[PDB]
Amino acid sequence: AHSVKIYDTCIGCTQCVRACPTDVLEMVPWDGCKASQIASAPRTEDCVGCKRCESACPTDFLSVRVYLGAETTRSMGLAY
Amino acid sequence: EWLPGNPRPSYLDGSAPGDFGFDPLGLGEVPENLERFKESELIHARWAMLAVPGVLIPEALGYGNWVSAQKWAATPGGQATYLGNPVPWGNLPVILAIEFLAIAFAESQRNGEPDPEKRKYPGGAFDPLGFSKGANLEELKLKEIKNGRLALVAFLGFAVQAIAYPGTGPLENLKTHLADPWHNTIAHVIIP
Amino acid sequence: VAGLTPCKESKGFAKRQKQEIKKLEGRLKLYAPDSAPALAINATIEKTKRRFEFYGNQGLLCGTDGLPHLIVDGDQAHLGEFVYPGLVFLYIAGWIGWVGRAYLIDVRTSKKPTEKEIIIDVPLALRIMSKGLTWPVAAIGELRSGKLVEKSSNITVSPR
Amino acid sequence: RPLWLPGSEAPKWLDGSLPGDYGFDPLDLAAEPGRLNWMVQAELVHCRWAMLGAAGIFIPELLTKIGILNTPSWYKAGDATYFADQGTLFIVELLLMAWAESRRWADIARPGSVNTDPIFPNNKLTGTDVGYPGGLWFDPLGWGSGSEDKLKEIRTKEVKNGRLAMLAVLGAFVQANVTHVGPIDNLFAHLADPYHTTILQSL
Amino acid sequence: ANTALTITLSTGALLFLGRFVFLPFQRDNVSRQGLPVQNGVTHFDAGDSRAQEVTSFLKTNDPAGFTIVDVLAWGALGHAVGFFILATINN
Amino acid sequence: MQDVKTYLSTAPVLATLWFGFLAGLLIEINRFFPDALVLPL
Amino acid sequence: IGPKRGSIVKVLRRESYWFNDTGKVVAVDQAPGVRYPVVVRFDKVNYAGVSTNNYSPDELEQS
Ligand SMILES: CC1=C(/C=C/C(C)=C/C=C/C(C)=C/C=C/C=C(C)/C=C/C=C(C)/C=C/C2=C(C)CCCC2(C)C)C(C)(C)CCC1
Ligand code: SF4
């Protein structure tokens, strides 16, 4: 549904994963930062699109980026 | 040397005839614009030096100024009096179609020269008296633009005297100035 | 000028003076002549008569409505309508703009530049509020010396 | 050196070399580098135009009060008729001011450049400092040369007499605006009743 | 008046300008500007069959390249000037 | 006064003291010189 | 790598808040493979409220 993209400006601060309320983001190993980890979005079909990860990203400009695309019953947040 | 002590710019070295360094606004700063400005400053000046005898000598001989000898074309009948004699072919569609043919053939043949120096001073057929093929060449070109800029300032004077004082000509502005010169100046135009 | 009669010879402007005192005179009829609210209306009438005799003596232009109109083109008769108090204004408004600009330069080279804007340093402020008196000589002086404007290489620019 | 305000620090730009320096730049109008070169030239024309101004405002009006010239007042001198038109004399002045000030403009910009004659170049001005055009046309008695301590005193006397004339001429201007009486008569109305002829009484 | 002489002389004046005066000015400009170009290619090169420049209609036998389109262009100005003159005279 | 004058130098107090002086001045201009539509000077 | 620690740099990154702004370098990572090693501290925060950001040496010049 929603497309969440991680860019190489990430410092591995992990707070995009901690702010995620639908378990989209996970921290995979990486070689481009001091923390040696970058975020990724394997369960991007579960993304509501709330951009809590973009609110918690301290990198200017943002490393996690959520693009609101086709919206399904996962990304609409319904219970009915 | 239009201002003693002023630094002349890098694009005005003094080797040009009349290169006095007068460019405060920097219009000739572009090199290819500056080559057109040098062949524009001379056609303008040569038309202006063909205009100052075309204004004063008709006025000094008594056939009116350059405005009242020009208002006949707006009139349906003016008959085109030349030296006090009406020419038979002096109709407005006749003399404009010749001017849009003869001058346009002259200006198109002028623009066809690829050399940027023969566009300035062609010579040859346009110099039959052989002064270009003489001992003095640089000072006569300085004589061209010093006389030319004087007539260019003169024609600017000629035009704005007609706007400020309609119905009068430049020798009639000279005769008005020669009577009481401390009362009738540009301050009559500046201060109404 | 612009089809407007002068207010000293305008019959509509004198009509508005007549119907304004008459409104205030009828307000005075229900008070005692030595009472305290009657002194306020009597001071209002003398304030009105001072106003109408001031508008006619300044060469104001009155239309068909009997109202003074301002000519802001820059007329030699009408300088005090727009040009004279505009130059008085822009001097005062440039004084506000020059002492606020010079305060920000004086606090940008400080230890905590953001605490000097919520808490304005009055000895630093009052020593340049006096200096805003001569500000056209200091604004064009900074313009000619290049200190008024900042070069675009040191200015935060949003991307295309 | 004495200063305009005791107990006040002199500004770093006014260091005391300039004739007439009393450390008086409270609003910082000559702080900038290269600016104090322009403000001395501005002071020198203004002081000399005011001493020319004070000799044409007060001296012919004083001799009118004695009655040996019968010259009109300076604020009504623009209404007086002459052999030339009053509007015409403005533009003839600013064509002559276009020459005299632009020769002065190049001296401030490029010093030592326009001391030579435009026509007969053997005639050269002997002035060395900026703003002091020594020569036969301007200093024929040669009083502008000598020791530097002696030259500083006579340059101090130009501007102290010049700043007084600036205040004088600015005073005559406001006196003729709110009282409409010439300024020698304003002096003679102040030696009769000084406590009743004051700026508050004239508003 | 004189419609048959005013129109003929004014068309012949503009065709004299088109053939002998402004023909190096026109032939240089139709080569410097060239054909109209979209995205680096000609409109006919991009696929428009209706944008092909005609060559049988432009096949001129004049030695200076003065074709029948230039007859229809410079002669059209000679009638525009010629009816400018006739309307101004008849007033 | 190392902190009382710091509070008095804050943004709302200095806006109140300046605009109290500013509106205090412009009212007192509008008493002795009222109905001023044209500057005579 | 990096220009210098404790030096004044100007950011050439277009999408940063501090583009054409004076910043102070506090840390340069000398480990290989790091894309943005130079840590630049700024006197002004961005809209997120932070002043610490990592840039490459290609996106900074000494000023
Ligand atoms: C010499 C020669 C020749 C011949 C040629 C010819 C003869 C030509 C002609 C030509 C012509 C014969 C042309 C014509 C043309 C025409 C045209 C082209 C027309 C057009 C028109 C128009 C278009 C107009 C318009 C209008 C209208 C319609 C109406 C309104 C107005 C107007 C006017 C605008 C040849 C080849 C043999 C060769 C040799 C030489
Ligand atoms: S919050 Fe931003 S900087 Fe931190 S790990 Fe996630 S994407 Fe990287």
Indicate the residue type of G45: V
Cα separation of A73 and A47, whole Å?
Answer: 10
Cα separation of D61 and D67, whole Å?
Answer: 9
CA–centroid distance, C7 to ligand 1, in Å, is 69
Nearest chain F Cα distance for residue C154, angstroms: 29
- Looking at the structure of chain E, the number of domains it has is 1
Q: Is E80 in the pocket of ligand 1 (CB under 6 A)?
A: yes
Q: Cis peptide before G42, with omega less than 30 degrees from 0?
A: no
CA–centroid distance, A7 to ligand 2, in Å, is 9
Q: Between chains, do B186 and D91 touch, taking CB under 8 Å as contact?
A: yes
Chain B CB contacts of D88 under 8 Å are: 182-185, 187-188
Cα separation of E10 and E3, whole Å?
Answer: 11
Render chain C in DSSP notation, one character per residue: -TT-EETTS-HHHHHHHHHHHHHHHHHHTTS-TTSHHHHHHHHHHHHHHHHHHHHTTTT-EE-TTS-EE---S--SS-STTTHHHHHHHHHHHHHHHHHHHHHHHHHHTSSSTTHHHHBT-HHHHHHHHTTTSS-HHHHHHHHHTT-SSPPGGGS-----
Residue bearing tokens 């002023």: B6
Q: Which residue of C has its CA nearest to F12?
A: C118
Going by the DSSP 8-state scheme, the letter that residue D10 receives in this structure is P
**Of E77, E75, E83, E73, the residue nearest E6 (C-alpha):** E83
Query: What are the extents of the domains in chain F?
Result: 1-41
Residues B144 and B38: beta-carbon distance below 8 Å: no
Instruction: Give me the residues paired with residue G55 across strands.
Output: G38
**Can you read off the two tokens belonging to residue B123?**
């010579």
Q: Between chains, do F14 and C122 touch, taking CB under 8 Å as contact?
A: yes
Chain D CB contacts of B5 under 8 Å are: 106, 109-110, 113-114
- Looking at the structure of chain G, the number of domains it has is 1
Decide: helix, strand or coil at residue E54: coil
**Can you read off the two tokens belonging to residue D13?**
């730009």
Q: How many CA atoms lie within 13 A of D156 on its CB side?
A: 13
CA dihedral (G28, G29, G35, G36) in degrees, to 10, reads -30
Distance of CA B107 to the CA centre of its chain: 16
Distance of CA E15 to the CA centre of its chain: 9
Q: Is E44 in the pocket of ligand 1 (CB under 6 A)?
A: no
Nearest chain C Cα distance for residue D27, angstroms: 4
User: D41: buried, middle or exposed (CB in 10 Å: 19+, 13-18, 0-12)?
Assistant: middle
Tell me the backbone φ, ψ of residue A27, rounded to 5 degrees.
-100, 115
Q: Is E19 in the pocket of ligand 1 (CB under 6 A)?
A: no
Which CATH code, of 1.10.600.10, 2.30.42.10, 1.10.3460.10, 3.40.630.30, is assigned to B31-190? Answer: 1.10.3460.10
Cα separation of D99 and C94, whole Å?
Answer: 35
CA angle at G12 for the pair G6 and G16, rounded to the nearest 5°: 90
User: D179: buried, middle or exposed (CB in 10 Å: 19+, 13-18, 0-12)?
Assistant: middle
Cα separation of A41 and A25, whole Å?
Answer: 5
**Can you read off the two tokens belonging to residue A24?**
């989209």
Chain G CB contacts of A61 under 8 Å are: 15-17
> How were these coordinates obtained?
cryo-EM
Cα separation of D40 and D162, whole Å?
Answer: 12
Q: D152-157: which pairs have CB atoms within 8 A and are 24 or more residues apart?
A: D152/D19, D155/D19, D155/D20, D156/D19, D156/D20
**Of G47, G33, G8, G35, the residue nearest G60 (C-alpha):** G8
- SS3 sequence of chain G: CCCCCCCEEEECCCCCCCECCEEEEEEECCCCCCCCCEEEECCCCCCCCCCEEEECHHHEEEC
Tell me the backbone φ, ψ of residue G24, rounded to 5 degrees.
-110, 125
CA–centroid distance, A45 to ligand 2, in Å, is 19
**Can you read off the two tokens belonging to residue D11?**
């500004």
Alpha helices (H) in chain B, listed in sequence order:
31-49, 52-60, 92-111, 138-164, 170-179, 187-190
Q: What burial letters (b/e) apply to D46-58, b meaning 16+ CB within 10 Å?
A: bbbebbebbeebb
Counts for chain B of helices (H) and strands (E), in that order: 6, 2
Query: Resolution limit in angstroms?
Result: 2.8
Largest CA distance in chain C: 76
D35-189, CATH topology level: Chlorophyll a-b binding protein (1.10.3460)
Cα separation of B29 and C77, whole Å?
Answer: 45
**Of C107, C101, C132, C105, the residue nearest C119 (C-alpha):** C107
Chains that touch E (3 or more CB pairs under 8 A): B
**Can you read off the two tokens belonging to residue D69?**
């010239």
Task: Work out whether the CA dihedral B176, B181, B183, B189 comes out positive or negative.
Answer: positive
Residues C79 and C58: beta-carbon distance below 8 Å: no
Residue bearing tokens 């301002």: C70
C131: how many CB neighbours lie within 10 A of its CB? 18
Residue bearing tokens 């004086």: C106
E86: how many CB neighbours lie within 10 A of its CB? 18
Residues B40 and B29: beta-carbon distance below 8 Å: no
Query: What are the extents of the domains in chain B?
Result: 31-190
